[PDB]
Amino acid sequence: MSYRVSTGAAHAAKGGGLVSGDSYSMMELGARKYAAAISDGARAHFESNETIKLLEKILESGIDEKIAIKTINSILSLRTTDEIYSTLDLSIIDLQDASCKFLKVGSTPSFIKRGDQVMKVQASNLPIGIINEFDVEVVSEQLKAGDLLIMMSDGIFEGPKHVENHDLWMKRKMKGLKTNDPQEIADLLMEEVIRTRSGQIEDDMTVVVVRIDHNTPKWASIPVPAI
Amino acid sequence: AMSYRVSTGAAHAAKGGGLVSGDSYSMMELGARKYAAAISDGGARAHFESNETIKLLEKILESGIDEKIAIKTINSILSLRTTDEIYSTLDLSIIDLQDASCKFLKVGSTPSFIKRGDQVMKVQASIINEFDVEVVSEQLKAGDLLIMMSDGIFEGPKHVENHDLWMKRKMKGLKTNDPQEIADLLMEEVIRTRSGQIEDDMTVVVVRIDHNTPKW
Amino acid sequence: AMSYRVSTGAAHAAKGGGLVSGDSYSMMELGARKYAAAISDGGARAHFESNETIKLLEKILESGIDEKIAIKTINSILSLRTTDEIYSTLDLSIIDLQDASCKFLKVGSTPSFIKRGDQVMKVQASIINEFDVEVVSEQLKAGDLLIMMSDGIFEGPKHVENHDLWMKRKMKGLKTNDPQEIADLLMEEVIRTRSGQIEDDMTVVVVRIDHNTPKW
Amino acid sequence: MSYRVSTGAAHAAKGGGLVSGDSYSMMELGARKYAAAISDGARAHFESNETIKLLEKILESGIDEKIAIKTINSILSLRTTDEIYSTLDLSIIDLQDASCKFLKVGSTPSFIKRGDQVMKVQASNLPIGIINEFDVEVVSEQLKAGDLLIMMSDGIFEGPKHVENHDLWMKRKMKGLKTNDPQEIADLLMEEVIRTRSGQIEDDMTVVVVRIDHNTPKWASIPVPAI
Ligand SMILES: OC[C@H]1O[C@@H](O)[C@H](O)[C@H](O)[C@H]1O
Ligand SMILES: OC[C@H]1O[C@@H](O)[C@H](O)[C@H](O)[C@H]1O
Ligand SMILES: [Mn+2]
Ligand SMILES: [Mn+2]
Ligand SMILES: [Mn+2]
Ligand SMILES: [Mn+2]
């Protein structure tokens, strides 16, 4: 079955704010590895791929998204015959301002529950007029305190044995959620389709869910002395 | 100016159920800066990884050698660091999600703590050690609670002669299992001992282990 | 105190002769510091590689995109460097040993030169460019001679208004094909124009291409 | 057939010596890639593996070689099932003082021609009393101006169809060398065994050869002014 971990953290800068000589990070290799690090003294403890780093750079600098798609596609071609033959689904949240960046690569789409308005993650203009070898999508939303972001592989977005518009099927099981708990939602959705064929599943299944919070904890309020 | 925080969960099954899976998933978080999550239908190549240096330190960890040889060699690596490294202190916890073993690397760090039920043990082990490296492994159990910190937190409390003790007492006092709450409480406690004054940067990270096993 | 220098050669054939080979070999040299050579009977994993940063710059090179997009992005990468990088100038030449194509990355560097027979061409190409990045490719030919340098060499000559010209003239004058001799001669020339005075650190690197094809 | 490259370099430090803000390096992926870099401003342009880095650290710090062998062996086990299943033959020359370090891993031995004294690279005491899974050897010689160092894969150290002590066979073709040229020697040795079965070879063949030089070039003599 494999262990899950649940985690939390808290941080505060000397004098009551600005920047800190403390850094911290963590990462999970789904079902295999969890790591956490703390440091006191330029370096991040963890990073992406190598190809993901690259596609990230681009995702950043000015670049008109139509160009970037082209460009990502070109780097994607550099992959060792062959690893890019799969689907890459990547959301990257900036924790300062809640801005999200999506990077899809031949992948099922993903959804944001907000209140209950469940908009789907689609890029405003699907650019025509180029070669998109790897069926590469790229998107920005602006996330808000409370949003539930859900992500899955084909093995679950399609699972629904009664096929036919899985889009509006998902938003259905999504709008009908008592809970607000990432791990529950995940564990639910998993069930809410396995049922659809009893046990034994066709494909591989994974879903991840992420909730954005902006709570200010009591300790954040405690004032620090004047100069 | 509060940073956004993120809470996350995931679920996963193989074909038939299931030797392995060509599905794979990862997430990582740079504290207060960045969160990323990734799914791949292949999966092979891990989405995220330790930076360089670390990646070597991890190899030495996985390799069961004598503490003494580990420490020598870890010292070699960290000696060859750049002005900005520096190499500060490092506190690294790596947990095997299959058996819940855990390796611990501390490079001049403060200690950390595990809260098994009502006990609170502290993570330490037993010549030259240029950067003050300590390597430890432990077997964790469901419901265990791992607490790491900077010295800002662990050395924060005013007029206290035994930080180990102060910390164990506070942790025995927790009436909660939620690692985010625990992280906030401890932060609250330490601050209130100075009177809002934050002598140093303060970081606490809390990890709970779960072998919960769901309907499906 | 003279550094040791190394001269090297290698030969290689496959099974039957031969689609590919599970043999593999590599060498690398850190100038004046270190030489390493490696053989593997497998071979898969390359013994040596570009450091991080570079490895990305190389990906962007291999990827045929618009100079303008390359340059933007290369600038992004090198902007995120550490105090000590810094990121100085970089002059990178990567040659495909299969077709002899060559990519060239110059990050604020001085130019470099190819001597085809009696000609001496110079390696350059044609808004914002934060670190002054230039990307170029060229097809090389047997007997070509590639010359890279720091500014210490290329800007070394006293009271000279056209370093391009000075350099082409010296290179047309070489009565030798040996890249070590060429490297020493040019170094000699530049020094003698100051009178032993070395205003700056001086580096010259010379690469000759060979499609020689031996008895076997 | 693939191109070879031949290369040379020259360097000198400001003021007439000490250290320099210039660095340079190069590397060759045999038959596939050559790279050269120059910089002006901690970073080396090129590096080893990741596992090789590690085995290098050890090879350095004090460690009694018997321990190191053990230790290398342990890291070697960490390899992805499976890449270490092959043979690793690594010589690492320090250019300041000509000291060599060998690291063999289930690999044919290597030789140094010196004048004509052709000693073979063997470690003074083959340590017994442990598990050497990967048949791992480790050696230091002190190299001198003029030494020819030769390295090959099985495909050529064994090639000799008339088998039976290939050790003393190699030193035979080695002592009988008019030339002093790395690439000739290589290209010779290759031939000097292919002949032994006409064309078509059993295995894969590679040999590399390295000559150590300490020439002081004229320019090194030209004096720089007093202070
Ligand atoms: O319990 C939630 C946490 O899981 C961890 O594996 C992730 O890295 C993330 O930083 C958190 O969201
Ligand atoms: O021509 C000899 C040179 O070959 C290059 O591929 C190597 O990197 C080495 O630095 C030199 O020995
Ligand atoms: Mn699938
Ligand atoms: Mn501190
Ligand atoms: Mn200079
Ligand atoms: Mn072989």
Residue numbers in the entry:
A (entry chain B), D (entry chain B): 589 to 629, 634 to 819
B (entry chain A), C (entry chain A): 588 to 629, 633 to 716, 722 to 811
Give the original sentences from the paper that presented this experimental model.
To gain structural insight into Mn2+ chelation in SpoIIE, we sought and obtained crystals of SpoIIE(590–827) from drops prepared from solutions in which the citrate was replaced by acetate and in which the protein was pre-incubated for 30 min with 2 mM MnCl2. The “citrate” and “acetate” crystals are essentially isomorphous, and a domain-swapped dimer is again observed. In the latter structure, we observed a single high-occupancy manganese (Mn2+) ion in the active site. The manganese ion in each active site of SpoIIE is coordinated by the side-chain carboxylates of Asp628, Asp746 and Asp795 with the Asp628 ligand provided by the partner subunit in the domain-swapped dimer. The octahedral coordination and the coordinating ligands (contributed by three carboxylates and two water molecules) are conserved in SpoIIE. The three metal ions in PstP, MspP, STP and tPphA are almost exactly superposed following an overlap of the structures based on protein Cα positions. In this comparison, the single metal ion in the SpoIIE structure superimposes closely with the first of the manganese ions, Mn1, of the bacterial phosphatases as shown for MtPstP in Fig. 5c. There would appear to be capacity in SpoIIE to coordinate a second Mn species, equivalent to Mn2 in the other bacterial phosphatases, since the corresponding protein ligands Asp628, Gly629 and Asp610 are conserved and appropriately situated. There does not however appear to be capacity to bind a third Mn2+, equivalent to Mn3, since only one of the coordinating protein ligands is conserved, this being Asp746 whose equivalent bridges the Mn1 and Mn3 metal ions in the other bacterial phosphatase structures.
